[PDB]
Swiss-Prot record, chain A:
Family: Belongs to the RNA polymerase beta chain family.
Family matches, as InterPro entries: DNA-dir_RNA_pol_bsu_ext_1_sf, DNA-dir_RNA_pol_bsu_external_1, DNA-dir_RNA_pol_su2, DNA-dir_RNAP_su2_dom, DNA-dir_RNAP_su2_hyb_sf, RNA_pol_bsu_bac, RNA_pol_bsu_CS, RNA_pol_bsu_protrusion
Keywords from the named record: Acetylation, Antibiotic resistance, DNA-directed RNA polymerase, Nucleotidyltransferase, Transcription, Transferase
Effect of residue 670 to H/K: Resistant to antibiotics salinamide A and B
Organism annotation: Escherichia coli (strain K12)
PTM text: Acetylated on several lysine residues in the presence of glucose.
Protein role: DNA-dependent RNA polymerase (RNAP) catalyzes the transcription of DNA into RNA using the four ribonucleoside triphosphates as substrates.
Domain of life: Bacteria
Gene: rpoB
Pfam families noted in UniProt: RNA_pol_Rpb2_1, RNA_pol_Rpb2_2, RNA_pol_Rpb2_3, RNA_pol_Rpb2_45, RNA_pol_Rpb2_6, RNA_pol_Rpb2_7
Protein's recorded name: DNA-directed RNA polymerase subunit beta
N6-acetyllysine: residues bearing it: 1015, 1193
Keyword Acetylation: yes
UniProtKB/Swiss-Prot annotation, chain B:
Effect of mutating residue 26 to C: Resistant to antibiotics salinamide A and B
Industrial or biotech use: Co-administration of salinamide and rifampicin or salinamide and myxopyronin suppresses the emergence of resistance to both antibiotics.
Annotated effect of mutating residue 9 to C: Resistant to antibiotics salinamide A and B
Lineage of the organism: Bacteria, Pseudomonadati, Pseudomonadota, Gammaproteobacteria, Enterobacterales
Family stated for the protein in its record: Belongs to the RNA polymerase beta' chain family.
Mutagenesis / variant outcome for changing residue 25 to T/V: Resistant to antibiotics salinamide A and B
Residues of the full protein shown: 755 to 804 of 1407
Effect of residue 4 to S/T: Resistant to antibiotics salinamide A and B
Source organism per UniProt: Escherichia coli (strain K12)
The record's account of how the chain is modified after translation: Acetylated on several lysine residues in the presence of glucose.
Quaternary state and interactors: The RNAP catalytic core consists of 2 alpha, 1 beta, 1 beta' and 1 omega subunit. When a sigma factor is associated with the core the holoenzyme is formed, which can initiate transcription. The rRNA transcription and antitermination complex (rrnTAC) consists of RNAP, NusA, NusB, NusE (rpsJ), NusG, SubB, ribosomal protein S4, DNA and precursor rRNA; S4 is more flexible than other subunits.
Effect of residue 29 to R: Resistant to antibiotics salinamide A and B
Cited function: DNA-dependent RNA polymerase (RNAP) catalyzes the transcription of DNA into RNA using the four ribonucleoside triphosphates as substrates.
Protein name (Swiss-Prot/TrEMBL): DNA-directed RNA polymerase subunit beta'
């Protein structure tokens, strides 16, 4: 018997979501192949800098293969410690020397294998980078293809600017190249977006004469001179949009008479008769423009030069001369406008020389151009990779713009590319052809992380390459390979700048596993100063119809940026050369194949693709002949015979952040935006509980990403600790003995970027054969293998009492009594000691001006131990700082040179706990510079570890002794019984006592070998520990050691915390009302969280309600199959209740009949839907208004949805039932800004008297002009007066005021504010003068 | 657009109609995006005058 999985929406998922880290791994892997050879990425940039050719030396540096050396540390010491992690870059180089100077006899090929050049960071096993200390991730970029386009018009916004077309080239590095027209029908060119210049000034520089230029924008019309008359090679297509200026006749048939216009009908009449020769007057040719030069072949005089317009006089000589081939230009008044013909006239330049010079000054105005500089600059504009490189993909996309055949070529542009492009530009301006699609993905290419890393790497190369040429001469003979050539400085200063200062790259969001994976798989529209800014984007923010199943049109962050980012969808993936190709199931005839194929954005429009919302039984039949199908933007009804391809599922349409949303189709894009962001702002909660409605992506995020630990090789688990999970692999014989030991470290309490804590609680128990791919430990919020951000509580939508006004949330008092929302927060308080004017600072516990409880928790080094119950006021770091002769008193100066120097020279300057927060120490930082001597700091902790390690052996040797000796006794007694005799002599003598010849003696012998062997292994085990502790020391980028104490405060649910579900209903907790007033059902179970029903009419998000009815009726829909049919097989006291209480509720033939099916039958009927424990609901193809209602009458208890409750205050019958259930909500993390900012009297600035915060004292709130006009509006005068006087600036005001309030009286009237003084003084010093006047 | 939408929020809203409404959904939220940064820009031009 075989059946269906039975779930909401019939959309079988054939190909599960691939690796989500395919955007980071695949890209950065091909970029820098550490393990593999050398190809693509960095290698594609080495063959453009290493091949250096410096004259007067003849040196050729050949490239071989690059191999990344040894890293710094692992991946855990980059967070718990202060490791920057920087892996050096070494490449194999084998250059040859051909000296060309004085006869020295130096000829050899010395091979310097590895050479250190640049320090580029690497990617973690997941897809993140580390530079300074915090996790840093590079977001991909998306802009217009580095080639050519044909938009509408620009620059003419102020004036009219009618009927004007133009083209634009948007490179990545170099100068711009534009081509626009003016009302005078003239074409120009903009280099680097500067002043306008003739569009024929760049052509002449490319070795193009006046005659050639004319034959690059217009077609040539050959005129023949025979029988003393003028003919012409007639072309019907060229007569489109022209008036008959003559009698167009051929073969004695007048097709078009003089007078009437030439329509599209007369054109086909000429193509049919194959008319390619007619008679044309002289006036018709007079309106044309001669291409080349034509001189009289009878006299030798010039008749007319090039570019010059023909006339009735010039043509009169061209006919008498004797020419037979007249090559001119074809121009009319419509689809062939003389634009270029009028460009050569307005061009000052006349050749190549005048062009190169004119451009040089236009680019670098100042020093007089030369013969070599003028040519060098021009070649470095659009004809050199070291200054202008359109990558290796730009060429491909540039070819499809001019309808080219091949797609391969060079990165730089040629003299034929620009010309061919300008040809189409004229066609559009004329009338033939239209514009191009910009938003189309065919142009907007995605820039992978690898490529991005190469972008900031190619820049550092052209900077160091300018130094290897000079230093080449500084080399003696053949030793200029190591450091005597290349410098790893210009490169580092170019790459490091992008990993921090760059706006494109920002801090990694690690407040949640799901929030991390959505950061890597993210696309950005902002980048270098060669693209777009933040001021404009009304053409890039808006999603284009072509962006289907390749990017979620509603995955952009909510706040300052809306539509500027937008992450990447699910199934979509950056293929090979930018072109994003989303999977499509190839379906032949009426049979769907399980095969998948990645179609291009330009190839999709060539085939008709069906949809996922179509009914399908299996994969060999089709439901209905006529089904809704889509093409490339339109909608039409196609048959199952016309359908060539079909979408994979309703998942590729959105991202992983929106795929988790149960009812996304029921939600509007408006609130759906925030709904995906609420998951991005999630926070690791204690009680991790998975939603009561999963889609099938909660288990993919944890596995693929670096969230859940995965075994390396199958084996048998022997032990399971919270900090480590050792796996005894049976590489040899099957025995409990040690063999393939592979320790797995689980990150417990380490500080992340969003001040969160990532944990990994082991799941595997004692003795459990694990398989390759099985889970070993959980994650920050994962339960077992799936994802669980928030929790599941009882929700009851009802306007309580004012509290839930706008976006407020009411929760019972039981929420604080239990740590269900108690999250872990970690704050870092760095304390650095720098050089003082009196000498370097010291880190000791000797700090005066403190209490006993302060130095109590502190050791004999000033650093507090681990696990201290610190609080607001306690000292975390024991730092000291000298005072100065000015701060010294004659009393403490005498004892300074008597009782020693270290008596009263230093003062109190330690790091304390910020006012308000109060937690405990979880991790202390240990550093001690060798140049500053290893004092008691690195000695005490060391001694402690030596004592612990020694104790770790005494305990192991105790169990090993009392574990084997307790076994050899039961063997010795057998045969040679010695009860009262064996318990006398020492334990080490029990080995000397033999036993009668027998196989039993062999046992005692083996146990004697195991004792010595194992013991010898534990002795050396302690030795290894006494090495790492007393070996090398790692320091921080700081100076004089750094003590970083991490504070952890239990952040309970208090008024101010914001929570939201997965629909977009964001709100903040109001007041924690007791379980007294809050309503409750007739069967106890009080309501946990209450929302406002008014958040539905305005905020269009009905979907959230669908989840409510799904949570309440979850005890009778799909979860019922696994909450009754599964529990009855376990407990024998339930199998008697489930079989009867089931049929009484659900009488559907489709459902499983417990009465008919046996214990074995039902078991297999619960494995088909095991993964979907809390039912299953896809994105845009799942639940239905008809399916849901039917599933609510199958189980307990209410009907139709709503149910009659009771008021918690009154207790009477609640008028009319209400919608209740279990909605899956989510708590949002608490940012630093959430921390209360209390300030009353702190420190002030120097130049200005404005209060300034920092570490201890909190920063004061600003009172902008906006707030100024507020009090300025009211009749109040003294309020706003002191607001910017006694409060802040005025120094004499903050003193008198405080001295008056403490007395009991009022403060003296505001005198002269500091602002009045400072400003006034800034005037007297000038030429003017301001003076206050009385009445 | 010449192709209207029939499906609504209640019933099964396909991926097509949901994509169409996104066009008009991008505008609204992208408007207040630059106003929340500095809403005292427009007011400044008036207050400093009268």
């Amino acid at each position: 018997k075989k059946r269906i999985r039975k779930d909401f929406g019939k959309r079988p998922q054939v190909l599960d979501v691939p690796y989500l880290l395919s955007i980071q791994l695949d890209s950065f892997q091909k970029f820098i192949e550490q393990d593999p050879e050398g190809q693509y990425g960095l290698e594609a940039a080495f063959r453009s800098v290493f091949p250096i050719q410096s004259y007067s030396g003849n040196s050729e540096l050949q490239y071989v293969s690059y191999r990344l050396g040894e890293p710094v540390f692992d991946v855990q010491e980059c967070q718990i410690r202060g490791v920057t992690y920087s892996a050096p870059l070494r490449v194999k180089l084998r250059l040859v020397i051909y000296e060309r100077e004085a006869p020295e006899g130096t000829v050899k090929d010395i091979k310097e294998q590895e050479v250190y050049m640049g320090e580029i960071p690497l990617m973690t096993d997941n897809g993140t980078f580390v530079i300074n200390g915090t996790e840093r991730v590079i977001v991909s970029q998306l802009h217009r293809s580095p080639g050519v386009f044909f938009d509408s018009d620009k620059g003419k916004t102020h004036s009219s600017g009618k009927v004007l077309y133009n083209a634009r080239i948007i490179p990545y590095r170099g100068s711009w190249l534009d081509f626009e027209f003016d009302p005078k029908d003239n074409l120009f060119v903009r280099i680097d977006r500067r002043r306008k210049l003739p569009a024929t000034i760049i052509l002449r520089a490319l070795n193009y004469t006046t005659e050639q230029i004319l034959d690059l924008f217009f077609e040539k019309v050959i005129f023949e001179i025979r029988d003393n008359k003028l003919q012409m090679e007639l072309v019907p297509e060229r007569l489109r949009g022209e008036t008959a200026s003559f009698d167009i006749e051929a073969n004695g048939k007048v097709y078009v008479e003089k007078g009437r216009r030439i329509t599209a009908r007369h054109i086909r009449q000429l193509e049919k008769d194959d008319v390619k020769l007619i008679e044309v007057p002289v006036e018709y040719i007079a309106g044309k423009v001669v291409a080349k030069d034509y001189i009289d072949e009878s006299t030798g005089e010039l008749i007319c030069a090039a570019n010059m317009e023909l006339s009735l006089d010039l043509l009169a000589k061209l006919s008498q001369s004797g020419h037979k081939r007249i090559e001119t230009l074809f121009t009319n008044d419509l689809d062939h406008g003389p634009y270029i013909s009028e460009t050569l006239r307005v061009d000052p330049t006349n050749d190549r020389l005048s062009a190169l010079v004119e451009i040089y000054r236009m680019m670098r105005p100042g020093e007089p151009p030369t013969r070599e500089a003028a040519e060098s600059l021009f070649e470095n504009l659009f004809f050199s990779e070291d200054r202008y490189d359109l990558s290796a993909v730009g060429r491909m996309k540039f070819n499809r713009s001019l309808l080219r055949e091949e797609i391969e070529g060079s990165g730089i542009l040629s003299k034929d590319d620009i010309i061919d492009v300008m040809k189409k530009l004229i066609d559009i301006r004329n009338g033939k052809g239209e514009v191009d699609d910009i938003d189309h993905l065919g142009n907007r290419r995605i820039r992978s992380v690898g490529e991005m890393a190469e972008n900031q790497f190619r820049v550092g190369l052209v900077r160091v390459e300018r130094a290897v040429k000079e230093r080449l001469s500084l080399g003696d003979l053949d030793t200029l390979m190591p450091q005597d050539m290349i410098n790893a400085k210009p490169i580092s200063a170019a790459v490091k700048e992008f990993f921090g200062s760059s706006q494109l790259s920002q801090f990694m969001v690690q407040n949640n596993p799901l929030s991390e994976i959505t950061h890597k798989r993210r696309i950005s529209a902002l980048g270098p100063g060669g693209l777009t800014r933040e001021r404009a984007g009304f053409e890039v923010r808006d999603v284009h119809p072509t962006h289907y199943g390749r990017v979620c049109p509603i995955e952009t962050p909510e706040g300052p940026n809306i539509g500027l980012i937008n992450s990447l969808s699910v199934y979509a993936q950056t293929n090979e050369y930018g072109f994003l190709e989303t999977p499509y199931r190839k379906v032949t005839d009426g049979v769907v194949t399980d095969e998948i194929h990645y179609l291009s954005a330009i190839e999709e429009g060539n085939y008709v693709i069906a949809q996922a919302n179509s009914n399908l039984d299996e994969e060999g039949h089709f439901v209905e002949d006529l089904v809704t199908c889509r093409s490339k933007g339109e909608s039409s009804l196609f048959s199952r015979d016309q359908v060539d391809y079909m979408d994979v599922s309703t998942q590729q349409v959105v991202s992983v952040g929106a795929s988790l949303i149960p009812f996304l189709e029921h939600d509007d894009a408006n609130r759906a935006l925030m709904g995906a962001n609420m998951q991005r702002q999630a926070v690791p909660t204690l009680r991790a509980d998975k939603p009561l409605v999963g889609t099938g992506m909660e288990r993919a995020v944890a596995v693929d990403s670096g969230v859940t630990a995965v075994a390396k090789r199958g084996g048998v688990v022997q032990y399971v600790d919270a900090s480590r999970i050792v796996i005894k692999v049976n590489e040899d014989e099957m025995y409990p003995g040690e063999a393939g030991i592979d320790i797995y470290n689980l990150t417990k309490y380490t500080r992340s970027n969003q001040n969160t804590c990532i944990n990994q609680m082991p799941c595997v128990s004692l003795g459990e054969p694990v398989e390759r791919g099985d889970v070993l430990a959980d994650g920050p919020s994962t339960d077992l293998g799936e994802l669980a951000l928030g929790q599941n509580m009882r929700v009851a939508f009802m306007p309580w009492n004012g509290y839930n006004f706008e976006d407020s949330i009411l929760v019972s008092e039981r929420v604080v009594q239990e740590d269900r929302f108690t999250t872990i927060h970690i704050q870092e308080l760095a304390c650095v000691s720098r050089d003082t004017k009196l000498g370097p600072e010291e880190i000791t516990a000797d700090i005066p001006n403190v209490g006993e409880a302060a130095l109590s928790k502190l050791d004999e080094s000033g650093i507090v131990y681990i696990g201290a119950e610190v609080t607001g006021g306690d000292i975390l770091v024991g730092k000291v700082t000298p005072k100065g002769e000015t701060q010294l008193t004659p009393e403490e100066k005498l004892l300074r040179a008597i009782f020693g120097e270290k008596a009263s020279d230093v003062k109190d300057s330690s790091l304390r706990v910020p006012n308000g927060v109060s937690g405990t120490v979880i991790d202390v930082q240990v550093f001690t510079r060798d140049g500053v001597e290893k004092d008691k700091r690195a000695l005490e902790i060391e001694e402690m570890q030596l004592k612990q390690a020694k104790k770790d052996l005494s305990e192991e040797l105790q169990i090993l002794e009392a574990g084997l000796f307790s076994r050899i006794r039961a063997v010795l007694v057998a045969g040679g019984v010695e009860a009262e005799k064996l318990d006398k002599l020492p334990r080490d003598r029990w080995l000397e006592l033999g036993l009668t010849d027998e196989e039993k003696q062999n046992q005692l012998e083996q146990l004697a070998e195991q004792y010595d062997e194992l013991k010898h292994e534990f002795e050396k085990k302690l030795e290894a520990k006494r090495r790492k502790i007393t070996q090398g020391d790692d320091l921080a980028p700081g100076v004089l050691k750094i003590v970083k104490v991490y504070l952890a405060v239990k952040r309970r649910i208090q008024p101010g915390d914001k929570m939201a579900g997965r629909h977009g209903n964001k709100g903040v907790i109001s007041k924690i009302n007791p379980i007294e007033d809050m309503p409750y059902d007739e069967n106890g179970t009080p309501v946990d969280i209450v929302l406002n029903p008014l958040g539905v009419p305005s905020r269009m998000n009905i979907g959230q309600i669908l989840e409510t009815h799904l949570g309440m009726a979850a005890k009778g829909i799909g979860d019922k199959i696994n909450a009754m049919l599964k529990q009855q097989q376990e407990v024998a006291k339930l199998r008697e209740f489930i079989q009867r209480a089931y049929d009484l509720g659900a009488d559907v033939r489709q459902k499983v009949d417990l009465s008919t099916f046996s214990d074995e039958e039902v078991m297999r009927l619960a494995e088909n839907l095991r993964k979907g424990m809390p039912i299953a609901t896809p994105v845009f193809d799942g639940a239905k208004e008809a399916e849901i209602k039917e599933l609510l009458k199958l189980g307990d208890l209410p009907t139709s949805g709503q149910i009659r409750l009771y008021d918690g205050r009154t207790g009477e019958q609640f008028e009319r039932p209400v919608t209740v259930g279990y909605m899956y909500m989510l708590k949002l993390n608490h940012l630093v800004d959430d921390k209360m900012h209390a300030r009353s009297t702190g420190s002030y600035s120097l130049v200005t008297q404005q209060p300034l915060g920092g570490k201890a004292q909190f920063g004061g709130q600003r009172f902008g002009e906006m707030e100024v006009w507020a009090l300025e509006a009211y009749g109040a005068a003294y309020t706003l007066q002191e607001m910017l006087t006694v409060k802040s600036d005025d120094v004499n005001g903050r003193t008198k005021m405080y001295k008056n309030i403490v007395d009991g009286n009022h403060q003296m009237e505001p005198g002269m504010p500091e602002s009045f003084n400072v400003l006034l003084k800034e005037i007297r010093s000038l030429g003017i003068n301001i003076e206050l006047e009385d009445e | 657009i010449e192709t209207p939408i029939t499906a609504n929020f209640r019933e099964g809203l396909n991926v097509l109609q949901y994509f169409i409404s996104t066009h008009g959904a991008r505008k609204g939220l992208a408007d207040t995006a630059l106003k929340t940064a500095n809403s005292g820009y427009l007011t400044r031009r008036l207050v400093d005058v009268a």
